[PDB]
From a paper:
A notable exception was the TRIM11 structure, in which a unique subdomain swap was observed. The crystal lattice contained two protein molecules in the asymmetric unit. In chain A, β-strands 7 and 8, usually located at the edge of the concave 6-stranded β-sheet, were displaced and interacted with the corresponding region in chain B, forming a hybrid β-sandwich. The equivalent β-strands in chain B, however, did not interact with chain A but were disordered, resulting in an asymmetrical dimer within the asymmetric unit. These observations raised the question of whether this domain might form a symmetrical subdomain-swapped dimer in solution. However, gel filtration analysis showed that the isolated TRIM11 PRYSPRY domain is largely monomeric in solution. Nevertheless, the observed subdomain swap in the crystal indicates an increased structural plasticity of this region of the TRIM11 PRYSPRY domain that was not seen for other family members. An interesting variation was observed for TRIM11, however, where two β-strands of the 6-stranded β-sheet showed increased structural plasticity, resulting in this segment either being disordered or forming a hybrid sheet with a neighboring molecule. While this assembly is stabilized by crystal packing, it nonetheless reveals the intrinsic flexibility of the swapped β-hairpin motif in this family member.
Numbering used by the authors: 276 to 459
Write the structure that this text describes.
Amino acid sequence: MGLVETLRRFRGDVTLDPDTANPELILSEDRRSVQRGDLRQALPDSPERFDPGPCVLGQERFTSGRHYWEVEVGDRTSWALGVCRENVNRKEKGELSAGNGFWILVFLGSYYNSSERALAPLRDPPRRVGIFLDYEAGHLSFYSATDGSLLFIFPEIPFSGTLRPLFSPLSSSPTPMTICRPKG
């Protein structure tokens, strides 16, 4: 029980916007969990829905200030988390890159190093990821919430207009990606 456990009580709520979700994604009834299946569902289409990008947005809109949120990913060795401009091309077929208004951390595999007999894994993958946004500082950074390690920090970003939190479970898995509710 140290300062980092206490300050994590600043984590805010995020609820997913079902109208933005790629048609392979399912959402929980409380809109805090998302899972990727292997089936394209029959959903009403619109410009707001990610296709073919396997993403969903939070309902929340960032225009200023400091924002922290936590996502349980569990055993996953594949996910993407961060933020994007409200006005991105949600039908983008190529890479979702900083140049097109996507600021996302992507976990696509694991590192090992050569050891005495074999290979050693570097670290347990994070089960819980914290995302920190400081709009005026142009700051976006990602942490392993359980041990407080930095995963990634973007270079200073010249944010303008509205940002949305972005979630992307990159594999099918029995493990939903879950937004952690605020404490109390």
